């Protein structure tokens, strides 16, 4: 729920964890996380442009190897 909206929006994408979130240049508002082997470009970790918009990147986030162990992102 935003100020500027005043309404309870649901996140369209179906995620497990939101290890990081926040505003980036050109996108406005963003969430890291996942949905549900050692290639850098596989990543298993969807960015999400907030307000139920496009995944926006699935290309150069952290490897799926590390996807099991990581608890926090900065």
């Amino acid at each position: 729920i935003s100020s500027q909206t005043g309404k309870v929006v649901s996140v369209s994408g179906n995620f497990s964890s939101i290890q990081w979130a926040g505003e980036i240049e050109n996108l406005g508002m963003v969430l890291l996380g996942l949905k549900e082997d050692y290639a850098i470009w596989n990543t298993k970790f969807c960015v999400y442009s907030l307000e139920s918009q496009e995944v926006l990147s699935d290309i150069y986030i952290i490897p799926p190897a590390y996807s099991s162990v990581v608890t926090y992102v900065h």
């Binding site: 926040g22 505003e23 980036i24 240049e25």
Partner: peptide, 28 residues
């Protein structure tokens, strides 16, 4: 005694602000 004082804080993107574009001018 405090050689610095913070009198505001502003919305910044990640890292921080892109150089050259921001401006500051003191009148009196």
């Amino acid at each position: 005694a405090p050689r610095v004082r913070y009198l505001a804080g502003f919305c910044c993107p990640l890292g921080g602000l892109a150089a050259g574009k921001p401006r500051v001018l003191c009148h009196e």
